[PDB]
Amino acid sequence: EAEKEFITMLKENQVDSTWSFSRIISELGTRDPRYWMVDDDPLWKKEMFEKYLSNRKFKEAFQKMLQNNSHIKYYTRWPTAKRLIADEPIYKHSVVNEKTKRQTFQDYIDTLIDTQKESKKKLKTQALKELREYLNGIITTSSSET
């Protein structure tokens, strides 16, 4: 019962990864007495808090999940896109960690921004070229000569 409500109050107190267990004692100890309804086991509260932060080849799976998230963006920031990927199993792995997540994300953002800018530039350049090749398959005939 205690845990169930504790998870709910954690959402309601707007708690997430950007929180310490100081903010829990300071804000959750006052916002609603649920933190006191369940007796204070600071180690369980903090263990379960690690659950609330975590749950709330390895790198290839991470690179692949990044793309499979339907709203991922290469024109956005890590904290703004995190809500797309935190629930996904591939966000956790035996060798994955904060530093690995930053590297695989940065390489993904940099590669997908460049391929998109290049694809659009190429589309315009190719069509310009195809049109220009078309003028060179007929007699020249300058407009200036009437």
Closest by CA position to 108, among listed 90, 126, 123: 90
Using only C-alpha atoms, what is the Rg of the chain? 27
C-alpha dihedral (92, 94, 98, 102), degrees to nearest 10? -80
Q: Is 14 left (phi over 0), alpha (psi -120 to 50) or beta?
A: left
For residue 21, give every residue at least 6 positions away whose Cβ sits within 8 Å of its Cβ, in sequence order, or none: 42, 45, 46, 49
User: Amino acid identity of 56?
Assistant: R
Q: Is 141 left (phi over 0), alpha (psi -120 to 50) or beta?
A: left
How much of the chain is in helix, strand and coil states, percent to nearest 5?
70, 0, 30
